C-alpha cells in the first residue's frame, strides 16, 4: 500500500512486421547482411545482431566486439 | 492434374504428422538455407514484389524444386496450420505463405516429386 512508484510496467515487444535481413541486387543474389556467427550449433544460420558497435547472437549468447 | 497436387497433399501430410515441417518465412528461410531441405511451396497471391522475388530467386540458387499454388489461405488450411473442428472453421487463420518439407517420413509416395522434377527437368 506503501506505492513510492505507483506501478511497475513490463515490456511489451516491439513487434515489427518485417524481417528485412536480404537484399538482392541486378535481377538477385543472396545478400547477407551481419558477420554470421561462426557457432557450432548456428554456424551459416541464424545471423548475429548489429548494434552501433558490436554484433550479437541471439541463440549463442556471445558477442564481437569493435574497439 | 489431381496426381500431383492432391500427391503433394499427401507427401506433406505425411510430413507434418512424421516430423516437423517449416511454416512461415523465418524458418522456411533457415530451413532451405541449411543443405538438407527438399521441395519449397509457395503461394501466388502475394502483395509485394519483394517477398517473391526473395523466396524464387534465393530457392533458384539452390537445387530444390519448386511448386507454386495460388492462395495462401487454402494453403494454410492444407498444411495442417489451424484448429480444425469437422463442423466449424477451415482455415481461422490467415494461411501459410510458403512452407519447405525437411523430411518426407517415409518414401511411400515420392514418384510424384520423381515425375515433378523430370517435367522440371524437361
Ligand atoms: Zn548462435
Known amino acids: 500500500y506503501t506505492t513510492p512508484?505507483?506501478?511497475?510496467?513490463?515490456?511489451?515487444?516491439?513487434?515489427?512486421?518485417?524481417?528485412?535481413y536480404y537484399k538482392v541486387d541486378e535481377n538477385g543474389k543472396i545478400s547477407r547482411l551481419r558477420r554470421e556467427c561462426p557457432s557450432d550449433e548456428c554456424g551459416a544460420g541464424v545471423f548475429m545482431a548489429s548494434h552501433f558497435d558490436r554484433h550479437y547472437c541471439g541463440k549463442c549468447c556471445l558477442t564481437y566486439c569493435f574497439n | 492434374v489431381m496426381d500431383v497436387n492432391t500427391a503433394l497433399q499427401e507427401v506433406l501430410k505425411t510430413?507434418?504428422?512424421?516430423?516437423?515441417?517449416?511454416?512461415?518465412?523465418?524458418?522456411?528461410?533457415?530451413?532451405?538455407?541449411?543443405?538438407?531441405?527438399?521441395?519449397?511451396?509457395?503461394?501466388?497471391?502475394?502483395?509485394?514484389?519483394?517477398?517473391?522475388?526473395?523466396?524464387?530467386?534465393?530457392?533458384?540458387?539452390?537445387?530444390?524444386?519448386?511448386?507454386?499454388?495460388?492462395?495462401?489461405?487454402?494453403?494454410?488450411?492444407?498444411?495442417?496450420?489451424?484448429?480444425?473442428?469437422?463442423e466449424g472453421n477451415p482455415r481461422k487463420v490467415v494461411g501459410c505463405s510458403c512452407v519447405?518439407?525437411?523430411?518426407?517420413?517415409?518414401?511411400?509416395?515420392?514418384?510424384?516429386?520423381?515425375?515433378?522434377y523430370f517435367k522440371c527437368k524437361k
Not at chain 2, 31 to 46: F, G, I, T, Y
Not at chain 2, 58 to 77: C, M, S, T, W
Not at chain 2, 100 to 116: L, M, R
Open chain 1, 5 to 20: 512508484k505507483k506501478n511497475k510496467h513490463k515490456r511489451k515487444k516491439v513487434k515489427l512486421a518485417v524481417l528485412k
Open chain 2, 15 to 86: 510430413a507434418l504428422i512424421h516430423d516437423g515441417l517449416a511454416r512461415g518465412i523465418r524458418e522456411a528461410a533457415k530451413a532451405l538455407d541449411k543443405r538438407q531441405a527438399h521441395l519449397c511451396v509457395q503461394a501466388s497471391n502475394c502483395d509485394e514484389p519483394m517477398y517473391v522475388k526473395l523466396v524464387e530467386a534465393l530457392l533458384a540458387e539452390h537445387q530444390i524444386n519448386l511448386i507454386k499454388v495460388d492462395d495462401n489461405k487454402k494453403l494454410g488450411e492444407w498444411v495442417g496450420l489451424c484448429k480444425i473442428d469437422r
Open chain 2, 100 to 116: 519447405v518439407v525437411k523430411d518426407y517420413g517415409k518414401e511411400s509416395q515420392a514418384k510424384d516429386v520423381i515425375e515433378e
